[PDB]
């Protein structure tokens, strides 16, 4: 059920996404969330993200709850506030959301330890898409990546479930993408979601 890049629905081309504000473009009921990013101790700006509930409802809702603080463990909220980007690969993608361990080993979802892959509808056809990181089939948790180039080799192995909205969002993505990293692609200076929520 993977769509080719000529069967893509309206509202998700790069140009369309860059015209987006705070409301969804693919389907009117898709939630829009945000991250405020700090690079080191410096405010870098806001990434706004449409979550494709219409195509990947379980993936969208997992991410959404981690943005708003609605998901609790024994009455303790857990989510993306304070989470970092631990793996940054220029010209490829930026990876983050490991609030469990901060190093890429963490996996927790709102549904349990993991959740299965939803249908692979959208391809990794351009920069600015949100997709699930995993460790093989049916191992989605909390980590995600934002594409910094097309990466269609990932199709049918990672669910594309959102898109960044507006030009500032992509500017922030590009800023994160270009920070200095070590030989393991970990940033030398931390990149952190200092605030997040729903618009």
């Amino acid at each position: 059920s993977l769509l080719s890049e000529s069967e893509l629905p309206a509202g998700i081309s790069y140009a369309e996404a860059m015209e987006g504000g705070s409301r969804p473009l693919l389907h009117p009921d898709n939630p829009v969330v945000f991250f405020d990013i700090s690079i080191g101790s410096h405010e870098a700006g806001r990434i706004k993200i449409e979550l494709f509930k219409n195509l990947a409802p379980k993936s969208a809702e997992n991410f959404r709850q981690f943005c708003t603080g609605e998901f609790r463990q024994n009455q303790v909220p857990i989510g993306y506030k304070g989470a970092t980007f631990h793996r940054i690969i220029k010209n490829f993608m930026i990876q983050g959301g490991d609030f469990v361990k901060g190093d890429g080993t963490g996996r927790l979802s709102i549904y349990g330890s993991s959740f299965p892959d939803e249908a692979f509808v959208l391809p990794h056809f351009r920069s600015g898409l949100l997709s699930l990181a995993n460790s093989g089939p049916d191992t989605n948790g909390c980590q995600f990546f934002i594409t910094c180039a097309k990466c269609d080799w990932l199709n049918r192995k990672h669910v594309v479930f959102g898109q960044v909205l507006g030009k500032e969002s992509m500017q922030v993505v590009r800023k994160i993408e270009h920070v200095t990293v070590d030989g393991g692609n970990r940033p030398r200076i931390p990149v952190t979601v200092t605030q997040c929520g729903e618009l």
Binding site: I89, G104, R107, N134, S135, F145
Partner: peptide, 11 residues
């Protein structure tokens, strides 16, 4: 390679 895993990063 250029994958996005969570635990064993492969080439």
């Amino acid at each position: 390679x250029l994958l996005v895993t969570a635990g064993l990063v492969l080439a």
